[PDB]
């Protein structure tokens, strides 16, 4: 493949004074953009949800729930606190085959309605990045969507790498 290069981290803001306890709970993925994310009219991406649970030791247990082949699929991972509040690395990285690097940065959030989170990983020596627009509900405003599109474009993503998953009711309620 050919991939749009990951942006330097200097183009990716960090939420100031990030509050780990307030970021906990369920978030819906209302927007998704990345260098391996592709818009698809034939079968448009369904919304999924991600649950953040703050463990005793201040890492997150992170569970994603997706409706796929008539069933609920669960993906679990551990985000370990990084150099600053709002940054994380992936726990137990040796148990993910091909994975040499995984970085999470919370870009912005108001905790009770929305968040943007930046992800970067190196897998099979290929550098992938994505931005998730999270909502506490399945809908967000035009203003928040446009902010997410503007930000995604500042990182070099064109429109067809920016998707808005369609709301569903299976699995994620
Ligand atoms: Cl996610
Ligand atoms: Th992943």
Residue pointed to by tokens 């989170």: 117
Distance of alpha carbon 78 from alpha carbon 60, whole angstroms: 6
Q: Which ligand is nearest to the CA of 26?
A: 1
Residue 162 near residue 152, CB atoms below 8 Å: yes
Distance of alpha carbon 167 from alpha carbon 170, whole angstroms: 10
Residues making up the binding site for a carboxymycobactin: 48-50, 121, 130, 134
List, as one string, the DSSP characters of 97-155.
TTEEEEEEEEEEE-SSSEEEEEEEEEETTEEEEEEEEEESSS---HHHHHHHHHHHHHT
* The two three-digit tokens of residue 159, written as one number: 């429109």
First-residue to last-residue Cα distance in the chain = 36
Q: Find the 129 Cα to ligand 1 centroid distance in Å.
A: 12
How many domains would you assign to the chain?
1
Q: Find the 64 Cα to ligand 1 centroid distance in Å.
A: 7
* The two three-digit tokens of residue 43, written as one number: 């079968």
CATH number for the domain spanning 82: value is 2.40.128.20
Residue 12 domain boundaries? 1-173
Q: Find the 133 Cα to ligand 1 centroid distance in Å.
A: 9
Closest CA to 26 of 90, 113, 86, 85: 113
Approach to solving: X-ray
Residue 7 near residue 130, CB atoms below 8 Å: no
Q: Find the 5 Cα to ligand 2 centroid distance in Å.
A: 17
78 by Cβ neighbours in 10 Å (0-12 / 13-18 / 19+) ranks as: middle
124 by Cβ neighbours in 10 Å (0-12 / 13-18 / 19+) ranks as: exposed
């Amino acid at each position: 493949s050919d991939l749009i290069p990951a942006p330097p981290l200097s183009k990716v803001p960090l939420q100031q004074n990030f509050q780990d306890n307030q970021f906990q709970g369920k978030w819906y993925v209302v927007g998704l953009a990345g260098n391996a994310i592709l818009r698809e009219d034939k079968d448009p991406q369904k919304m999924y949800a991600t649950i953040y649970e703050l463990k005793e030791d201040k890492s997150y247990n992170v569970t994603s729930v997706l409706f796929r082949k008539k069933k609920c699929d669960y993906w679990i991972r551990t985000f370990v606190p990084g150099s600053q509040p709002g940054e994380f690395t992936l726990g137990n990285i040796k148990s993910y085959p091909g994975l040499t690097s995984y970085l999470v940065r919370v870009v912005s959030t108001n905790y009770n309605q929305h968040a943007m989170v930046f992800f970067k990983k190196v897998s099979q020596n290929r550098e992938y990045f994505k931005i998730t627009l999270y909502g506490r509900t399945k809908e967000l405003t035009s203003e928040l969507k446009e902010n997410f599109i503007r930000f995604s474009k500042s990182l070099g993503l064109p429109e067809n790498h920016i998707v808005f998953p369609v709301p569903i009711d299976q699995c994620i309620d």
